[PDB]
Design a protein around this ligand. Sequence first.
Ligand SMILES: [Zn+2]
Ligand SMILES: [Zn+2]
Ligand SMILES: [Zn+2]
Length: 85
Amino acid sequence: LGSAFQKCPICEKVIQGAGKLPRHIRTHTGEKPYECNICKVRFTRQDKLKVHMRKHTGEKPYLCQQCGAAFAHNYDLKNHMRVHT
DNA sequence: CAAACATGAAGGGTCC
DNA sequence: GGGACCCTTCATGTTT
Ligand SMILES: [Zn+2]
Ligand SMILES: [Zn+2]
Ligand SMILES: [Zn+2]
């Protein structure tokens, strides 16, 4: 009822955080909308994709600031950036 | 064959 | 709303 909490429409559990209901709903539906650009593994949250990318940034340190895609060469990252703008 | 242990994935808290 | 990191539980694998 408070602005800090939401009720899940599927399971009626209370969830904390104004924007944090969608990440809970995806745990029901299985939606994994974040994909590692290197190994294509998918994740339910940007949260855990960012941590997963640590596996790759040792060899691919050039990171997109919009989506976190990792690249071995800066000219690869620059070509990626065309996709955003 | 079970119990302990390591590791990490999953999910929800919590604070900018 | 988003990013970021924390905290706890639990699943899986490995060691003892
Ligand atoms: Zn729910
Ligand atoms: Zn990956
Ligand atoms: Zn990008």
